[PDB]
């Protein structure tokens, strides 16, 4: 076969590295070369199951692989319950990455299996595992202390008491995703800053009980934060913005959609101390004026992606500043100005300096003409600009 004559093993394994386990077992039946290739270790490293619900597969992989399963994705495999994952856990003790996103029949029972048998976990994804309680976080905190990444998204019955148990053991978490955990409040934020000083990424989206008391504490306790999401946390004020500036000089991503009270005061204090911001989502920060964008153009040389959706007060002026940024001349690619009612064709002429722009959104910017769009596409063919036209 040409395939074997022209492609070396290193490349053949790269091909097989994209293959399901079923297809990988059929290649084992092709030849003696393709047998040694189909069963090489590097092909049993990660499994992503894309199967049928009616399970025993996860248990059969646990035996055929066992010792070398390192990453296991079960996202959306509603078939699996505690029984399969017990079997897999006792057979795959070296697992470092487990993704149980959407596995709805999962109980505290599997986090206990994981605690007993999977002390090398660095990455646990529990998104939408709704039957998980605080007790699961206690078991994980005992047996999974090297956890670097935990995702509790939409695990709505988790409370501050579970968070406390979890971080008291998983002191080394670098990424913690808590989106849609609406019972979380400021005490749970305070347990996090107490123990998770190496935290790089924190997602609090729709955790609308939290306040400045909790967020300010988090900045005090987590000086290595690079990514923070607080969209939907309406209670927040510029006080949380001042604490970020004061404590988090490595901030790269700040999502604060729907945080109405944020003002220019907060963002000026934030901008001056945070020279590594790359993404900022300020959708529905209505009080924000052109002044906020002014500071961003000065103090944020690497700004990459900016959303000003529904920031009504923004005018063509602030856009001129962005375009005459150091970041705007090459390092801005995504700008979202929709429902900024004051933006006109002139802003699109400003953004003709932004040779790096890939994506521009102008929905509901009614002052913007089909003409303006066409001449911007003409100067910057790189840009996809998006309006309702």
């Amino acid at each position: 076969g040409l395939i074997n004559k022209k492609l070396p093993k290193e490349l053949l394994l790269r091909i097989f590295s994209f293959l399901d386990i079923v297809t990988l077992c059929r290649c084992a039946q092709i030849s003696k070369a393709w047998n040694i290739l189909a069963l090489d270790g590097s092909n049993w490293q990660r499994i992503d199951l894309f199967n049928f619900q009616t399970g025993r597969v996860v248990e059969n992989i646990s035996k055929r692989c066992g010792g070398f399963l390192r990453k296991l994705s079960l996202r959306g495999c509603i078939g699996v319950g505690d029984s399969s994952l017990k079997t897999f856990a006792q057979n795959c003790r070296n697992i470092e990455h487990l993704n149980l996103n959407g596995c709805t029949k999962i109980t505290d029972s599997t986090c206990y299996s994981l605690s007993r048998f999977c002390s090398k976990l660095k990455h646990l994804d529990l998104t939408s595992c709704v039957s998980i309680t605080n007790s699961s976080l206690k078991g994980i905190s005992e047996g999974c202390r090297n956890l670097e990444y935990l995702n509790l998204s939409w695990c709505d019955q988790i409370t501050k008491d579970g968070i406390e148990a979890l971080v008291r053991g998983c002191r080394g978490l670098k990424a913690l995703l808590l989106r849609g955990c609406t019972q979380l409040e400021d005490e749970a934020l305070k347990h996090i800053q107490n123990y998770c000083h190496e935290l790089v990424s924190l997602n609090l989206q729709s955790c609308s009980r939290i306040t400045d008391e909790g967020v300010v504490q988090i900045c005090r306790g987590c000086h290595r934060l690079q990514a923070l999401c607080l969209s939907g946390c309406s209670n927040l004020t510029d006080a949380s913005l001042t604490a970020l500036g004061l404590n988090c000089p490595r901030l790269q991503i700040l999502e604060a959609a729907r945080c109405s009270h944020l003002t220019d005061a907060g963002f000026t204090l934030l901008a001056r101390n945070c020279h590594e911001l790359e993404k900022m989502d300020l959708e529905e920060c209505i009080l924000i004026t052109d002044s906020t964008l002014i500071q961003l153009s000065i103090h944020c040389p690497k700004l990459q992606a900016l959303s000003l959706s529904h920031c009504e007060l923004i005018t063509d002026d602030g856009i001129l500043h962005l375009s005459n940024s150091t970041c705007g001349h090459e390092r801005l690619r995504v700008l979202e100005l929709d429902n900024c009612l004051l933006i006109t064709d002139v802003a699109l002429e400003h953004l003709e300096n932004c040779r790096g722009l890939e994506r521009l959104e102008l929905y509901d910017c009614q002052q913007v003409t089909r003409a303006g769009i066409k001449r911007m596409r003409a100067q910057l063919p790189h840009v996809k600009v998006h309006a309702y036209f």
Binding site: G1, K6, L11, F18, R26, C27, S31, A38, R46, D48
Partner: protein, 148 residues
């Protein structure tokens, strides 16, 4: 902002420097090169890619400004990759030599897609691999690896 690239056979290609540094290998050679005023404007030598493969690569890089998985290939690339097996393997090698991770992903996913959805003899027919297993061994392997 344009460089010349010379293929293995000596044909020279004017390419914009931006679309061409999608190649980590090409970006490396530029960085290695000058910073030179006083040269002869010699092109960047690419001894391990012939002009036909280069053509296909440059066309792939111009179209792009921009998980164990193969249903992922964009439709432009699917069409682009409807080539004979020999050139597609050469495109894998080129993508590997030039370190164009986008191209090496789609091409590998494309060969991977040629294996999926077929029986072992349908595999060996697609790639003209000789079955060197006795019926004893073929029955065996369609043994372990059969679970499923």
């Amino acid at each position: 902002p344009s460089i010349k690239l010379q293929s293995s056979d000596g044909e020279i290609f004017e390419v914009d420097v931006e679309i061409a540094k999608q190649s980590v290998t090409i970006k490396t050679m530029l960085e290695d090169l000058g910073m030179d005023d006083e040269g002869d404007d010699d092109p960047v030598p690419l001894p391990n890619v012939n002009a036909a493969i280069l053509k296909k690569v440059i066309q792939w890089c111009t179209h792009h400004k921009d998980e164990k998985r193969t249903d992922d290939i964009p439709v432009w690339d699917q069409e682009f990759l409807k080539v004979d097996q020999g050139t597609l393997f050469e495109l894998i090698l080129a993508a590997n030599y030039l370190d164009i991770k986008g191209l090496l992903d789609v091409t590998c996913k494309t060969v991977a897609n040629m294996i999926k959805g077929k029986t072992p003899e349908e595999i060996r027919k697609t790639f003209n691999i000789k079955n060197d297993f006795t019926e004893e061994e073929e029955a065996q392997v369609r043994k372990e690896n059969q679970w499923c």
